[PDB]
Amino acid sequence: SALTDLFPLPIVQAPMAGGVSVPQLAAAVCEAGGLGFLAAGYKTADGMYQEIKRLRGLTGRPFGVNVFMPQPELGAVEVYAHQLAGEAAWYETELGDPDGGRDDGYDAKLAVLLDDPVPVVSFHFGVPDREVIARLRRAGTLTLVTATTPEEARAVEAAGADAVIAQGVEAGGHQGTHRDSSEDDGAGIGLLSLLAQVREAVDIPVVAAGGIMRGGQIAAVLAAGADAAQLGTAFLATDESGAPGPHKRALTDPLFARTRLTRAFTGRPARSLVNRFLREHGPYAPAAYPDVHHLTSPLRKAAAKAGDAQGMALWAGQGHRMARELPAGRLVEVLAAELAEARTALS
Amino acid sequence: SALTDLFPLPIVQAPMAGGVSVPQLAAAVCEAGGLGFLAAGYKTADGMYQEIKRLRGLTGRPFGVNVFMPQPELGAVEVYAHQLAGEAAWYETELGDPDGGRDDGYDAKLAVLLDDPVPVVSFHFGVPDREVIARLRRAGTLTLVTATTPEEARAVEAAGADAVIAQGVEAGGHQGTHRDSSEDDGAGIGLLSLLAQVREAVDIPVVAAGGIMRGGQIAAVLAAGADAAQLGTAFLATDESGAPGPHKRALTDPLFARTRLTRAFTGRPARSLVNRFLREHGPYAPAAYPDVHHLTSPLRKAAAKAGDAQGMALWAGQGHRMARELPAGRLVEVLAAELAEARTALS
Ligand SMILES: Cc1cc2nc3c(=O)[nH]c(=O)nc-3n(C[C@H](O)[C@H](O)[C@H](O)COP(=O)(O)O)c2cc1C
Ligand SMILES: Cc1cc2nc3c(=O)[nH]c(=O)nc-3n(C[C@H](O)[C@H](O)[C@H](O)COP(=O)(O)O)c2cc1C
């Protein structure tokens, strides 16, 4: 596998936007033998570029950069904004402009990634034109794309991508569906089932993602056909992670015992720890991304500033309670040991 | 493991009520090295007893019998019944009596199982009094209980059960939650995540269940800590399965491409292929089991008689599209080969 040939361990640190996966995190993962990732989501092409340069100065090993696919333009937003008036007053801040960018600097970011190629680039919220995949391939970059169904995985393969990331329903953060609709509600596929379906639907390498917190689960996905395992929440809790303290603390807090997929914070289905904001607005959140995301961004910033986890987007997979707080490099070592231990057991 | 010591292969054929798992199915599984299961759900103690005798004449190998835990008594039922008036008229049959038994012959069935012990007994919809577990243990019967969360699994262990069945959200048929409430809606845990959580929550053997259709997935759960894999949908499609033809046909029918958890047919969350009945009544089905089950039973019988899959409870796990139609014994052989193939790959 061209992908797994880049790094020794079948472990990928999921790109996590919002200041979570900073250069220091990716570097520690890379240096430990895994594939570190930078998140270009919500950053400017320049911001992304600065982190790429930063990381190259931290490690000479392969790493990835994740980018969001532009989203097409859509009454519901107006109603939701109204329902958030109380939040705005409480956090003493104005709601953001719902119409503040849908491309997320896609064109400028691609220019950067093509002018100064990185080892791996992944895409979320859809599939790039096959010309984009081809140009990146020519530049020597491996391409990955998330799929949540075997149909989406076939689309990833048809686009010429090098590998597909099979993200199960257990995953933390945003579901990487190529298109969001009310129908996806309750249609999420468990990773073990999605992995098997995707493996039989395409011939390209598969990276399993969703709820993976232990080396034994990594062995599990490998046994089921995956070439590697991508972990977000497990790394969110590490020291190098730039996730806010209230967010890291919530992962193992009994008061945040459960997670749920919701459009409350961004207008697109994303798994977060259940908190006040989710309980109050989740049932009425409309499918309007990134409109809703822009709308609530100021609210979330204010909540974070105050250290109030009840008003934050506590992205977390279903395995959050198993999060371990230690250096990312040491977590890779523990995962590697658990993986080896599980391998031996299976024989 | 006392459980896996009973049969050579780490494969369990899930008990499936409604005439699906008949003696011939269990026998073929047992004879192939797996653990065949009889379903006592909805049958009288006598009906269950006749199948047990039948099976003993078909195989001398270990098998299991599954029983439903009695359910406590609960306006909503009246409203749902009203909404089903059209179904009653269309299928030209009366709705069943919502108050037609909540114990499901529990006491009489236990008397039978204790007077003429079987190798394995499993429980669904809760946990038996620890005295029941103790008496069965003394009689030489191994006890299994389904859990859908680590909390429920701890309850299973505390009751003294020999093993817990970790049933993930991908599972077909009824979710084995110990108590049903609107809160369980959207709280389902993916099997790979549930398995890891349960493995760290209890010390007793774990049987993984939900979406398992291939030997590689069996290797996957073993790698993650399970002692065996329990498969329902995979066996539902075999020749020995007594599932109605329209039900077996629906599993791979593109027109029934998706599944969803619903209370439409029985008043308790159960995963079925999306069909007309589910689309129409699912959104309004109340949490009232087995009240709703009794209510719709006549409707489902009529639909089945007519071969109309749109009015049937098409129980199926998320891996239904991978169903294979062949003798159950041959399916065990294929699964065994896939398991071995996956083991080798992991090393
Ligand atoms: C903190 C949070 C932020 C995330 N940000 C991104 C992102 O910017 N781009 C992306 O492709 N995936 C993102 N993900 C999803 C991950 O790629 C991965 O699918 C998920 O973390 C898998 O679940 P666990 O989180 O591993 O259960 C994010 C997940 C979380 C936890
Ligand atoms: C046809 C249908 C009927 C079922 N009946 C029972 C039952 O009577 N008792 C029980 O404990 N589980 C029952 N199950 C659930 C199974 O024990 C198991 O959890 C499920 O089949 C696992 O998913 P797949 O179906 O293996 O994805 C049933 C499942 C389906 C498919």
mmCIF file of N, CA and C in Angstrom, chain A residues 22-107:
data_model
loop_
_atom_site.group_PDB
_atom_site.id
_atom_site.type_symbol
_atom_site.label_atom_id
_atom_site.label_comp_id
_atom_site.label_asym_id
_atom_site.label_seq_id
_atom_site.Cartn_x
_atom_site.Cartn_y
_atom_site.Cartn_z
ATOM 1 N N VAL A 22 -2.567 21.147 15.990
ATOM 2 C CA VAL A 22 -1.507 22.100 15.685
ATOM 3 C C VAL A 22 -0.231 21.359 15.269
ATOM 4 N N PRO A 23 0.745 22.076 14.679
ATOM 5 C CA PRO A 23 1.996 21.442 14.250
ATOM 6 C C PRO A 23 2.631 20.525 15.296
ATOM 7 N N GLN A 24 2.663 20.964 16.550
ATOM 8 C CA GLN A 24 3.263 20.148 17.598
ATOM 9 C C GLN A 24 2.605 18.782 17.743
ATOM 10 N N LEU A 25 1.304 18.699 17.491
ATOM 11 C CA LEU A 25 0.625 17.409 17.598
ATOM 12 C C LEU A 25 1.056 16.510 16.442
ATOM 13 N N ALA A 26 0.914 17.014 15.222
ATOM 14 C CA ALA A 26 1.278 16.247 14.037
ATOM 15 C C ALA A 26 2.723 15.761 14.109
ATOM 16 N N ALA A 27 3.627 16.641 14.527
ATOM 17 C CA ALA A 27 5.034 16.276 14.635
ATOM 18 C C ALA A 27 5.254 15.108 15.596
ATOM 19 N N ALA A 28 4.644 15.170 16.778
ATOM 20 C CA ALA A 28 4.806 14.097 17.760
ATOM 21 C C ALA A 28 4.310 12.774 17.193
ATOM 22 N N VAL A 29 3.198 12.821 16.469
ATOM 23 C CA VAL A 29 2.644 11.618 15.864
ATOM 24 C C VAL A 29 3.624 11.104 14.798
ATOM 25 N N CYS A 30 4.027 11.986 13.885
ATOM 26 C CA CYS A 30 4.974 11.620 12.830
ATOM 27 C C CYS A 30 6.255 11.020 13.400
ATOM 28 N N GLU A 31 6.832 11.690 14.393
ATOM 29 C CA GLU A 31 8.072 11.227 15.001
ATOM 30 C C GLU A 31 7.942 9.881 15.701
ATOM 31 N N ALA A 32 6.720 9.520 16.081
ATOM 32 C CA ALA A 32 6.468 8.252 16.758
ATOM 33 C C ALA A 32 6.153 7.146 15.756
ATOM 34 N N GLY A 33 6.144 7.489 14.474
ATOM 35 C CA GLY A 33 5.879 6.486 13.457
ATOM 36 C C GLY A 33 4.499 6.506 12.829
ATOM 37 N N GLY A 34 3.637 7.405 13.290
ATOM 38 C CA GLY A 34 2.301 7.488 12.725
ATOM 39 C C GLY A 34 2.237 8.603 11.697
ATOM 40 N N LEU A 35 1.046 8.866 11.173
ATOM 41 C CA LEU A 35 0.871 9.928 10.190
ATOM 42 C C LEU A 35 0.177 11.114 10.839
ATOM 43 N N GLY A 36 0.943 12.171 11.105
ATOM 44 C CA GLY A 36 0.377 13.363 11.706
ATOM 45 C C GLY A 36 -0.417 14.125 10.660
ATOM 46 N N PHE A 37 -1.397 14.906 11.104
ATOM 47 C CA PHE A 37 -2.236 15.668 10.186
ATOM 48 C C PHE A 37 -2.467 17.106 10.627
ATOM 49 N N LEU A 38 -2.526 18.000 9.648
ATOM 50 C CA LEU A 38 -2.812 19.405 9.900
ATOM 51 C C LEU A 38 -4.227 19.610 9.370
ATOM 52 N N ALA A 39 -4.968 20.519 9.989
ATOM 53 C CA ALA A 39 -6.332 20.802 9.566
ATOM 54 C C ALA A 39 -6.372 22.184 8.936
ATOM 55 N N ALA A 40 -6.746 22.259 7.661
ATOM 56 C CA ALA A 40 -6.822 23.552 6.983
ATOM 57 C C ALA A 40 -8.243 24.121 7.068
ATOM 58 N N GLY A 41 -9.158 23.322 7.614
ATOM 59 C CA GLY A 41 -10.537 23.751 7.749
ATOM 60 C C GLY A 41 -10.690 25.033 8.550
ATOM 61 N N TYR A 42 -11.411 25.987 7.971
ATOM 62 C CA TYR A 42 -11.672 27.289 8.580
ATOM 63 C C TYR A 42 -10.478 28.245 8.623
ATOM 64 N N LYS A 43 -9.316 27.814 8.136
ATOM 65 C CA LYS A 43 -8.147 28.699 8.115
ATOM 66 C C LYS A 43 -8.030 29.322 6.731
ATOM 67 N N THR A 44 -7.199 30.352 6.603
ATOM 68 C CA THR A 44 -6.976 30.984 5.309
ATOM 69 C C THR A 44 -5.866 30.158 4.679
ATOM 70 N N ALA A 45 -5.664 30.309 3.377
ATOM 71 C CA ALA A 45 -4.613 29.564 2.697
ATOM 72 C C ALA A 45 -3.268 29.901 3.337
ATOM 73 N N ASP A 46 -3.130 31.143 3.791
ATOM 74 C CA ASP A 46 -1.891 31.573 4.427
ATOM 75 C C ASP A 46 -1.706 30.904 5.780
ATOM 76 N N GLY A 47 -2.780 30.845 6.560
ATOM 77 C CA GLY A 47 -2.705 30.214 7.866
ATOM 78 C C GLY A 47 -2.270 28.771 7.711
ATOM 79 N N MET A 48 -2.880 28.083 6.753
ATOM 80 C CA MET A 48 -2.543 26.696 6.482
ATOM 81 C C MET A 48 -1.070 26.605 6.097
ATOM 82 N N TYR A 49 -0.639 27.484 5.198
ATOM 83 C CA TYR A 49 0.742 27.461 4.741
ATOM 84 C C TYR A 49 1.751 27.648 5.869
ATOM 85 N N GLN A 50 1.449 28.534 6.814
ATOM 86 C CA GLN A 50 2.357 28.767 7.932
ATOM 87 C C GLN A 50 2.516 27.508 8.779
ATOM 88 N N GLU A 51 1.430 26.771 8.989
ATOM 89 C CA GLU A 51 1.521 25.550 9.785
ATOM 90 C C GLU A 51 2.337 24.495 9.047
ATOM 91 N N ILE A 52 2.146 24.406 7.736
ATOM 92 C CA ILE A 52 2.894 23.444 6.936
ATOM 93 C C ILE A 52 4.390 23.710 7.089
ATOM 94 N N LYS A 53 4.784 24.972 6.976
ATOM 95 C CA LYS A 53 6.193 25.332 7.119
ATOM 96 C C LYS A 53 6.677 25.007 8.531
ATOM 97 N N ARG A 54 5.852 25.348 9.514
ATOM 98 C CA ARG A 54 6.160 25.102 10.914
ATOM 99 C C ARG A 54 6.451 23.618 11.133
ATOM 100 N N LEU A 55 5.543 22.775 10.656
ATOM 101 C CA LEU A 55 5.668 21.331 10.807
ATOM 102 C C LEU A 55 6.911 20.742 10.139
ATOM 103 N N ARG A 56 7.259 21.247 8.958
ATOM 104 C CA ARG A 56 8.435 20.756 8.252
ATOM 105 C C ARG A 56 9.690 21.029 9.072
ATOM 106 N N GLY A 57 9.622 22.050 9.918
ATOM 107 C CA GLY A 57 10.749 22.385 10.766
ATOM 108 C C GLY A 57 10.744 21.522 12.014
ATOM 109 N N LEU A 58 9.624 20.847 12.263
ATOM 110 C CA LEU A 58 9.504 19.977 13.430
ATOM 111 C C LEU A 58 9.776 18.524 13.081
ATOM 112 N N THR A 59 9.454 18.126 11.853
ATOM 113 C CA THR A 59 9.693 16.747 11.441
ATOM 114 C C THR A 59 9.950 16.631 9.947
ATOM 115 N N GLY A 60 10.740 15.633 9.572
ATOM 116 C CA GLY A 60 11.037 15.417 8.169
ATOM 117 C C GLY A 60 10.234 14.236 7.662
ATOM 118 N N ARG A 61 9.401 13.679 8.538
ATOM 119 C CA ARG A 61 8.579 12.527 8.188
ATOM 120 C C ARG A 61 7.266 12.937 7.518
ATOM 121 N N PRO A 62 6.643 12.015 6.761
ATOM 122 C CA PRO A 62 5.381 12.290 6.061
ATOM 123 C C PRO A 62 4.240 12.724 6.973
ATOM 124 N N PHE A 63 3.445 13.669 6.485
ATOM 125 C CA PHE A 63 2.300 14.187 7.223
ATOM 126 C C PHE A 63 1.205 14.542 6.225
ATOM 127 N N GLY A 64 0.009 14.811 6.735
ATOM 128 C CA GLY A 64 -1.087 15.158 5.857
ATOM 129 C C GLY A 64 -1.705 16.503 6.173
ATOM 130 N N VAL A 65 -2.456 17.019 5.207
ATOM 131 C CA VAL A 65 -3.160 18.285 5.342
ATOM 132 C C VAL A 65 -4.578 17.998 4.846
ATOM 133 N N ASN A 66 -5.574 18.378 5.635
ATOM 134 C CA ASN A 66 -6.965 18.130 5.274
ATOM 135 C C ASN A 66 -7.664 19.416 4.855
ATOM 136 N N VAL A 67 -8.454 19.347 3.789
ATOM 137 C CA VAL A 67 -9.173 20.529 3.324
ATOM 138 C C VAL A 67 -10.666 20.242 3.150
ATOM 139 N N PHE A 68 -11.490 21.263 3.370
ATOM 140 C CA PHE A 68 -12.936 21.117 3.233
ATOM 141 C C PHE A 68 -13.373 21.450 1.813
ATOM 142 N N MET A 69 -14.314 20.669 1.292
ATOM 143 C CA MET A 69 -14.840 20.901 -0.043
ATOM 144 C C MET A 69 -15.777 22.096 0.021
ATOM 145 N N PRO A 70 -15.783 22.932 -1.031
ATOM 146 C CA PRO A 70 -16.675 24.092 -1.027
ATOM 147 C C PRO A 70 -18.110 23.582 -0.929
ATOM 148 N N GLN A 71 -18.978 24.345 -0.275
ATOM 149 C CA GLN A 71 -20.366 23.940 -0.133
ATOM 150 C C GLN A 71 -21.275 24.884 -0.911
ATOM 151 N N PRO A 72 -22.251 24.331 -1.643
ATOM 152 C CA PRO A 72 -23.174 25.162 -2.422
ATOM 153 C C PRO A 72 -24.136 25.920 -1.515
ATOM 154 N N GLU A 73 -24.608 27.068 -1.989
ATOM 155 C CA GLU A 73 -25.544 27.885 -1.223
ATOM 156 C C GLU A 73 -26.874 27.147 -1.092
ATOM 157 N N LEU A 74 -27.631 27.448 -0.041
ATOM 158 C CA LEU A 74 -28.918 26.791 0.165
ATOM 159 C C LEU A 74 -29.933 27.255 -0.870
ATOM 160 N N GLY A 75 -34.737 30.948 5.039
ATOM 161 C CA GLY A 75 -35.842 30.968 5.982
ATOM 162 C C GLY A 75 -35.532 30.241 7.279
ATOM 163 N N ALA A 76 -35.013 29.022 7.169
ATOM 164 C CA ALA A 76 -34.675 28.227 8.345
ATOM 165 C C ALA A 76 -33.554 28.874 9.158
ATOM 166 N N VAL A 77 -32.564 29.425 8.463
ATOM 167 C CA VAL A 77 -31.434 30.077 9.115
ATOM 168 C C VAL A 77 -31.901 31.271 9.941
ATOM 169 N N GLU A 78 -32.837 32.029 9.380
ATOM 170 C CA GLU A 78 -33.385 33.201 10.051
ATOM 171 C C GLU A 78 -34.077 32.790 11.350
ATOM 172 N N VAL A 79 -34.849 31.709 11.283
ATOM 173 C CA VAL A 79 -35.565 31.201 12.445
ATOM 174 C C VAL A 79 -34.614 30.703 13.532
ATOM 175 N N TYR A 80 -33.558 30.006 13.125
ATOM 176 C CA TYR A 80 -32.592 29.484 14.083
ATOM 177 C C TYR A 80 -31.854 30.639 14.746
ATOM 178 N N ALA A 81 -31.481 31.635 13.948
ATOM 179 C CA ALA A 81 -30.781 32.806 14.465
ATOM 180 C C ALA A 81 -31.632 33.434 15.562
ATOM 181 N N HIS A 82 -32.923 33.564 15.280
ATOM 182 C CA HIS A 82 -33.865 34.136 16.231
ATOM 183 C C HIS A 82 -33.840 33.344 17.537
ATOM 184 N N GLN A 83 -33.889 32.021 17.416
ATOM 185 C CA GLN A 83 -33.885 31.141 18.578
ATOM 186 C C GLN A 83 -32.584 31.220 19.371
ATOM 187 N N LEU A 84 -31.547 31.791 18.766
ATOM 188 C CA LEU A 84 -30.255 31.925 19.437
ATOM 189 C C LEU A 84 -30.069 33.304 20.073
ATOM 190 N N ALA A 85 -31.088 34.155 19.979
ATOM 191 C CA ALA A 85 -31.004 35.499 20.546
ATOM 192 C C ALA A 85 -30.621 35.457 22.021
ATOM 193 N N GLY A 86 -31.173 34.490 22.750
ATOM 194 C CA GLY A 86 -30.864 34.363 24.164
ATOM 195 C C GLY A 86 -29.396 34.055 24.396
ATOM 196 N N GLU A 87 -28.838 33.181 23.564
ATOM 197 C CA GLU A 87 -27.428 32.807 23.674
ATOM 198 C C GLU A 87 -26.556 34.041 23.434
ATOM 199 N N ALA A 88 -26.913 34.818 22.417
ATOM 200 C CA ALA A 88 -26.166 36.024 22.080
ATOM 201 C C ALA A 88 -26.145 36.998 23.261
ATOM 202 N N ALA A 89 -27.309 37.224 23.858
ATOM 203 C CA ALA A 89 -27.416 38.129 24.998
ATOM 204 C C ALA A 89 -26.616 37.602 26.191
ATOM 205 N N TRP A 90 -26.773 36.316 26.491
ATOM 206 C CA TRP A 90 -26.068 35.705 27.613
ATOM 207 C C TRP A 90 -24.553 35.786 27.477
ATOM 208 N N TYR A 91 -24.036 35.395 26.317
ATOM 209 C CA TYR A 91 -22.602 35.436 26.084
ATOM 210 C C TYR A 91 -22.174 36.838 25.675
ATOM 211 N N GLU A 92 -23.127 37.767 25.713
ATOM 212 C CA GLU A 92 -22.887 39.169 25.375
ATOM 213 C C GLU A 92 -22.078 39.356 24.099
ATOM 214 N N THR A 93 -22.557 38.754 23.019
ATOM 215 C CA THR A 93 -21.880 38.854 21.738
ATOM 216 C C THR A 93 -22.901 38.709 20.617
ATOM 217 N N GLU A 94 -22.573 39.259 19.456
ATOM 218 C CA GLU A 94 -23.453 39.202 18.294
ATOM 219 C C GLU A 94 -23.280 37.886 17.544
ATOM 220 N N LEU A 95 -24.352 37.399 16.932
ATOM 221 C CA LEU A 95 -24.262 36.166 16.161
ATOM 222 C C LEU A 95 -23.435 36.510 14.928
ATOM 223 N N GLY A 96 -22.722 35.529 14.383
ATOM 224 C CA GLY A 96 -21.909 35.787 13.208
ATOM 225 C C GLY A 96 -22.755 35.904 11.954
ATOM 226 N N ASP A 97 -22.158 36.394 10.873
ATOM 227 C CA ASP A 97 -22.878 36.536 9.610
ATOM 228 C C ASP A 97 -23.020 35.145 8.998
ATOM 229 N N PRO A 98 -24.262 34.682 8.784
ATOM 230 C CA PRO A 98 -24.481 33.355 8.201
ATOM 231 C C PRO A 98 -23.900 33.213 6.802
ATOM 232 N N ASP A 99 -23.729 34.340 6.121
ATOM 233 C CA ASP A 99 -23.182 34.333 4.771
ATOM 234 C C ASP A 99 -21.737 34.808 4.791
ATOM 235 N N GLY A 100 -20.874 34.033 5.443
ATOM 236 C CA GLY A 100 -19.473 34.403 5.535
ATOM 237 C C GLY A 100 -18.484 33.441 4.899
ATOM 238 N N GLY A 101 -18.787 32.970 3.690
ATOM 239 C CA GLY A 101 -17.880 32.064 3.003
ATOM 240 C C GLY A 101 -18.301 30.606 2.978
ATOM 241 N N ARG A 102 -18.328 30.017 1.786
ATOM 242 C CA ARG A 102 -18.710 28.617 1.635
ATOM 243 C C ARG A 102 -17.610 27.782 0.981
ATOM 244 N N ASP A 103 -16.616 28.458 0.414
ATOM 245 C CA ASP A 103 -15.503 27.797 -0.267
ATOM 246 C C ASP A 103 -14.345 27.459 0.672
ATOM 247 N N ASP A 104 -14.255 28.182 1.784
ATOM 248 C CA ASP A 104 -13.204 27.976 2.778
ATOM 249 C C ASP A 104 -11.793 28.054 2.180
ATOM 250 N N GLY A 105 -11.606 28.972 1.234
ATOM 251 C CA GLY A 105 -10.308 29.162 0.602
ATOM 252 C C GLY A 105 -9.805 28.002 -0.235
ATOM 253 N N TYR A 106 -10.721 27.142 -0.663
ATOM 254 C CA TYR A 106 -10.386 25.969 -1.469
ATOM 255 C C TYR A 106 -9.388 26.227 -2.606
ATOM 256 N N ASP A 107 -9.708 27.175 -3.483
ATOM 257 C CA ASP A 107 -8.836 27.481 -4.617
ATOM 258 C C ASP A 107 -7.440 27.923 -4.204
#
